[PDB]
Amino acid sequence: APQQINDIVHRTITPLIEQQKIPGMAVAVIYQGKPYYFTWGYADIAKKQPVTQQTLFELGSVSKTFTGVLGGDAIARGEIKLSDPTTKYWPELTAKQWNGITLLHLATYTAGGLPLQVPDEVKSSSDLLRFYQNWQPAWAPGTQRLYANSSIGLFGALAVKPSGLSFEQAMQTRVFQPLKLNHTWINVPPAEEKNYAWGYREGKAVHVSPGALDAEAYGVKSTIEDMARWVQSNLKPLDINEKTLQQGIQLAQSRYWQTGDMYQGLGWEMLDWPVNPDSIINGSDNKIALAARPVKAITPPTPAVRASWVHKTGATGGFGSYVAFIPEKELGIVMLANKNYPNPARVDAAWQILNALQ
Numbered sequence: 494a495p496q497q498i499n500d501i502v503h504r505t506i507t508p509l510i511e512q513q514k515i516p517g518m519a520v521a522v523i524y525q526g527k528p529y530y531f532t533w534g535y536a537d538i539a540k541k542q543p544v545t546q547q548t549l550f551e552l553g554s555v556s557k558t559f560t561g562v563l564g565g566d567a568i569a570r571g572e573i574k575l576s577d578p579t580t581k582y583w584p585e586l587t588a589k590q591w592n593g594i595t596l597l598h599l600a601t602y603t604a605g606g607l608p609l610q611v612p613d614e615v616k617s618s619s620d621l622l623r624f625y626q627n628w629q630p631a632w633a634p635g636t637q638r639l640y641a642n643s644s645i646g647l648f649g650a651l652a653v654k655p656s657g658l659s660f661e662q663a664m665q666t667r668v669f670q671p672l673k674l675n676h677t678w679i680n681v682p683p684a685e686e687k688n689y690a691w692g693y694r695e696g697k698a699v700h701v702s703p704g705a706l707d708a709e710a711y712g713v714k715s716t717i718e719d720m721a722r723w724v725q726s727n728l729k730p731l732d733i734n735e736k737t738l739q740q741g742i743q744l745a746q747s748r749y750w751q752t753g754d755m756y757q758g759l760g761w762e763m764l765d766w767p768v769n770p771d772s773i774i775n776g777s778d779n780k781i782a783l784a785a786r787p788v789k790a791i792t793p794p795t796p797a798v799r800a801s802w803v804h805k806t807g808a809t810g811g812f813g814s815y816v817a818f819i820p821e822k823e824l825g826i827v828m829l830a831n832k833n834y835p836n837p838a839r840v841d842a843a844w845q846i847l848n849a850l851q
């Protein structure tokens with residue numbers, strides 16, 4: 494813990510927790526590739542259990558970074574191609590709006606307006622097929638971006654089909670185990686519940702509810718230590734010894750589409766470094782309920798750029814998470830909290846910390 498990191502982290506996060514009334518928080522800073530950990534407050538207010546480096550937080554849409562990397566690993570295995578039609582992996586999807594919609598479009602939210610959430614009514618595999626068959630795109634494929642769990646969720650499910658494995662087993666064996674993320678879970682096992690923080694929403698304790706495509710879109714829980722290790726793996730994929738996983742991480746940071754100053758990867762989003770802080774700060778707003786934005790295709794996709802701000806926000810009803818890193822500077826941050834507080838306050842704190850260290 495060098496005093497400078499200690500000082501910028503406490504100087505930034507202390508007022509963040511006060512203003513946002515966050516019950517519990519863990520932060521990791523990766524600096525010159527080494528992790529430094531900080532924690533505050535309570536994993537479980539009622540039971541007086543503190544946040545520790547072993548506390549599990551719900552990552553919410555940060556889970557989409559794992560789905561994009563797992564998809565990247567399947568491409569690198571030669572199991573799928575992003576240029577494949579969706580129907581190649583789900584031939585029961587016969588409705589003609591699907592002609593021309595590829596795995597790329599599903600992975601990058603550019604299928605033509607798939608909705609943010611899969612309806613609660615949708616449970617069984619037959620419900621899911623009915624839902625997609627009935628879905629009417631607002632736009633031609635590859636023209637507009639509309640962030641959507643029903644889009645990347647479906648990408649994650651289709652992407653593991655040729656493997657033979659369930660999504661969870663594919664994720665454990667191909668991503669969590671090789672990276673030694675041994676306290677990262679799609680389903681929290683009973684032995685681990687003692688570490689699982691409660692989320693707080695309007696001051697009620699809550700955990701994420703089951704739903705269709707939950708594992709694929711928002712269902713991972715992890716510790717600050719594992720998430721530091723996730724950032725390290727994404728900062729420096731060349732250190733990873735599993736050839737397809739290395740390549741997969743690299744593919745998830747390729748630049749597929751541009752809107753404004755942002756580039757869409759698989760799960761990750763990226764901006765050129767140095768970034769305008771107001772551009773990433775205002776650019777995070779899950780207070781715009783639906784922003785549909787025109788995309789320009791990057792033909793062909795640019796390979797992972799080292800001078801990028803690579804990041805992802807994520808929330809559940811009770812949790813707020815943020816991950817950001819700059820490959821060229823070997824520098825990153827993870828912030829995990831058990832309240833869903835506004836995204837601009839996350840990116841502002843993250844930028845203030847990494848700016849000061851850069």
Ligand SMILES: O=C(O)c1ccc(CCNS(=O)(=O)c2ccsc2C(=O)O)cc1
Pocket residue numbers: 553554555609610642701702703704705707710711779806807808809810
């Ligand atoms: O009980 C469920 O199945 C459930 C749980 C959490 C959520 C919110 C999870 N966050 S998210 O992936 O759906 C999302 C959506 C818009 S922003 C965002 C995020 O995670 O930042 C949705 C449904």
